Structures are given as structure tokens and as C-alpha cells.
Design a protein around this ligand. Structure first.
Ligand SMILES: *Cc1c(COP(=O)(O)O)cnc(C)c1O
Length: 461
């Protein structure tokens, strides 16, 4: 299923190799076949295959760090320069003053709930943090082997890491009939069923969600923390999309803030690792890959393994670290760039909110498609109601129903989306992942195509 695509020798001292593996399923192969058809002049109903997958201050600080001579330029505000200088001067858990900046950023975001720089670890993406935390937590054998609880629909990193570590995957189903909510009665069933054949010890929460685009309510975060406390579960709070919250009905509440607000009975006891990245959201930068995790209440046995693991790895590249520093040091009240930064953010978030409402509106006025509200992150996961007969057609082709549907959509419109079966879903349900990344007029055009295709599809099978 997985095939070797590339290798990179990252270093010899210490020696690290990075291997890329590609899954080359039916859609990937067909998209390639179609791209070559278009290249040798085959006339198609579309002219291209479409996949789909800004803040001045950040560009400015980045430009200053790339070319420090611009610290004497007047093309640049002084609050930018102040960031560049601190980063240039600073360049084991990560650079000290960057960890301080993250801590201070957490504190501001959480309305004054304190964060300690010594609980911060800089990583090469949230992926690296999640891998590292899961690796130090998995142990035991047979019926005592660590169970890791993960949502369905999945962000497929977690399944993959669980396999590499030979841990046991414990599925919990996000609640599609209540905006993809985490449902504790459901988590309780999943934990109770898994205890026969593993030791459930870890619970991974993705908020805002991917590919489901939901934002959890405070009460629900609170009920999950209580459940984790009760069952002695280590929580991983994957919060990489925390700045991309759109709905006026929703806000981002960190697991950190809620844990602390529940009081010391919880906040002294519950183990929590919260992740953040430089790659996601409207503050997202590319090229320079950074991240952090904030870890609280780490059991000493676990911390020992972390200290060792970090003694034998190289620090994350400092440019990733610098990138993270920029994202956790935006301008604050009374600084030169605060007002324009504030206007740029609001405009970007208003445009996403607009695309979100637009997408969900269109799907919900098309029969046989239903879309939960898109509250944050960049993806929707619409449910497709595939007739028992289009299901039969799909079966005849040896394909999952939504794979077949997504293949046909590609073949007719050139629109290339990922089927729900790439993420997992409740048995008997079918979805696909949609992005709101495209600009509004293009997004409108994609949604028209998806609508026409969808109506015809139902007519046909
Ligand atoms: C992309 C992503 C990650 C990994 O983040 P990087 O910083 O790119 O490693 C983790 N969790 C979710 C939900 C993601 O979308």
C-alpha cells in the first residue's frame, strides 16, 4: 500500500534519515492519468485538475531576519525591528528566550493563566511533538500494551504513529449529529470496550478539528478533562488550528486554560501536552518549520525518558524556532503595528468565515449532501447520502462508495477531493473532505461543479 518515494540524510552527527512513502490509490493514479491526457491535448469538460491544499507584520519581521541590514531601513516599523533584533541575538528544550516568549504568549491567550518556560519544548512541527510524546508513553505487552484513543474521522498522523510504535489504536467517534462534538458517554464506551485487550492510557483531542472543522465548547472541553482525570488518561491537545476560529457562536478555549480554571484538584494531577505549529492558520509560514508543546504534570517516569530523548537529538533548526518566535510575539496594544495587524487579522478571518458560511449553505441546499457548520480550521467534511444502488455500483468496481463517488467527480469535473474512507467514518456513512482555501469566486465555481456532479450522480446510479 505504502511505497518508497524518497530519502534524505538529514545528518551524520547524529545520523538521521527521513523516508517519504506515498500511498498511490485509485484517485492519485486517475488524477495523474487525467493530467497527462490534458497535456497531450485531449479535450475535457474541464481544463485542469483542482486539488486546493497576508499579514504584513510577519513578512516584515521575516524580511528583517533574512537581511539584517534592513534594521537601519525606514521601510520598517520599530516594533518589527525589535522582534528581529531579539531573534537575531538569541537565534536543549529550545532557545531560552523563545520559550519565554511562548510562555508569555500562552498566558496572554489564556487571560492571565500562567505558563512556565520550563514546560515548553520547541519541536520541528507539532508532528514532531506528537511523535515524541506518544513514543515516551507507549509501553507494556499484550493485554497491558498502551491503548491510544484517537477520533474518527481521523487526522491520519495519529494512526500511523500508533502503528510505528506498536501501540493499540482505540477509536472514538466524533458526534456527527451534534456538530462533531466529543461525547463523553461515547468516550466512556470506547475506553470500557478497549480494556479487555489493552491498557487505555492516552486520549488525543483535535481542537479545532481536522478534517471536521469543528470547535468544541468550553463545557465539552471541561467534561473531557474530567473524564481524563477519572480514567487516568494522558491528554494530547492538538491545537494547531487555534487562531482559525470563524463562527460567531464559537471560540477557542485551550485545554490549558480550562484545566486550570477547574482548580488544583484537576490542574495538579491531569497530564496534558498541548501542541502548536507555525504551518497552520492565517499566521502560517512555510519554509521555516517550527512548533512547540506545552507539557504539564508530566509523571517523573515520563520526564526521565524525555530528558534522555532530548540529550541525543539535535535541537530543532533555529529558523523554525525563530519562525515560532515571530508567531508568538504579535504586536500588542500601544505598539506601532498593533492597529494594522488587528485589521489584517480580522479581514482574513472575516473572509474565511464568509467562505465557511458559503460552503455549508450550498451543501445544505443540495439534496443528498449535508454539511455540519464549519467553525474553524480549513476543511469541511460533508456527508453524502449515497443510494443503496450507487453503493452497489461502487462495490462492483471493488471500491468503497465514497471512493467511487470521488473518482467520478474527478473524471467529470477535474475536482480532486479526498474520500471519507481516507479518514475513517461511522460504518454506513460516506463523506468527502472539502477545503475553503480557494478564493471566494473560485470556491463558488468549485461548489457549483460539485453540485452539478452530485445531482447527475444520483440520476445515474
Ligand atoms: C498538520 C497538522 C499537524 C502537524 O503540524 P506540523 O506543525 O505541520 O507538524 C498536527 N495536527 C493537525 C490536526 C494537523 O492538521
Amino acid at each position: 500500500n505504502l511505497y518508497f518515494q524518497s530519502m534524505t540524510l538529514e545528518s551524520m552527527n547524529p545520523q538521521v534519515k527521513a523516508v517519504e512513502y506515498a500511498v498511490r490509490g485509485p484517485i492519485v493514479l486517475k488524477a495523474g492519468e487525467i493530467e497527462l491526457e490534458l497535456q497531450r491535448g485531449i479535450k475535457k469538460p474541464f481544463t485542469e485538475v483542482i486539488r486546493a491544499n497576508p499579514i504584513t507584520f510577519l513578512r516584515q519581521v521575516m524580511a528583517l531576519c533574512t537581511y539584517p541590514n534592513l534594521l537601519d531601513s525606514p521601510s520598517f516599523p520599530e516594533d518589527a525591528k525589535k522582534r528581529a533584533r531579539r531573534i537575531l541575538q538569541a537565534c536543549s528544550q529550545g532557545v531560552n528566550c523563545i520559550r519565554e516568549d511562548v510562555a508569555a504568549y500562552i498566558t496572554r491567550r489564556d487571560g492571565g493563566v500562567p505558563a512556565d518556560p520550563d514546560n515548553i519544548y520547541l519541536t520541528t512541527g507539532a508532528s514532531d511533538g506528537i511523535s515524541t510524546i506518544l513514543k515516551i508513553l507507549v509501553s507494556g505487552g499484550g493485554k497491558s500494551r498502551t491503548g491510544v484513543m484517537i477520533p474518527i474521522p481521523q487526522y491520519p498522523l495519529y494512526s500511523a504513529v500508533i502503528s510505528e510504535l506498536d501501540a493499540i489504536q482505540v477509536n472514538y467517534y466524533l458526534d456527527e449529529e451534534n456538530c462533531w462534538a466529543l461525547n463523553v458517554n461515547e468516550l466512556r464506551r470506547a475506553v470500557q470496550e478497549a480494556k479487555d485487550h489493552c491498557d487505555p492510557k492516552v486520549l488525543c483531542i483535535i481542537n479545532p478539528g481536522n478534517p471536521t472543522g469543528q470547535v468544541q465548547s468550553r463545557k465539552c472541553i471541561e467534561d473531557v478533562i474530567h473524564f481524563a482525570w477519572e480514567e487516568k488518561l494522558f491528554l494530547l491537545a492538538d491545537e494547531v488550528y487555534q487562531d482559525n476560529v470563524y463562527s460567531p457562536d464559537c471560540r477557542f478555549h485551550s485545554f490549558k486554560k480550562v484545566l486550570y480554571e477547574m482548580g488544583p484538584e484537576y490542574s495538579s494531577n491531569v497530564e496534558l501536552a498541548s501542541f502548536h505549529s507555525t504551518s497552520k492558520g492565517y499566521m502560517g509560514e512555510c519554509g521555516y518549520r517550527g512548533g512547540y508543546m506545552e507539557v504539564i504534570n508530566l509523571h517523573p517516569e515520563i520526564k526521565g525518558q524525555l530528558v534522555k530523548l532530548l540529550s541525543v537529538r539535535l535541537c530543532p533548526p533555529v529558523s523554525g524556532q525563530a519562525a515560532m518566535d515571530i508567531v508568538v510575539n504579535p504586536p500588542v496594544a500601544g505598539e506601532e503595528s498593533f492597529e494594522q495587524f488587528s485589521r489584517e487579522k480580522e479581514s482574513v478571518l472575516g473572509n474565511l468565515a464568509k467562505k465557511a458560511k458559503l460552503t455549508e449553505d450550498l451543501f445544505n441546499q443540495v439534496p443528498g449532501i449535508h454539511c455540519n457548520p464549519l467553525q474553524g480550521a480549513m476543511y469541511a467534511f460533508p456527508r453524502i447520502f449515497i443510494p443503496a444502488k450507487a453503493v452497489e455500483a461502487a462495490q462492483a468496481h471493488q471500491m468503497a462508495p465514497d471512493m467511487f463517488y470521488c473518482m467520478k467527480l474527478l473524471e467529470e469535473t477535474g475536482i480532486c477531493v479526498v474520500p471519507g474512507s481516507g479518514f475513517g467514518q461511522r460504518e454506513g456513512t460516506y463523506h468527502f473532505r472539502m477545503t475553503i482555501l480557494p478564493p471566494v469566486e473560485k470556491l463558488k465555481t468549485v461548489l457549483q461543479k460539485v453540485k452539478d456532479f452530485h445531482i447527475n450522480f444520483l440520476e445515474k446510479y
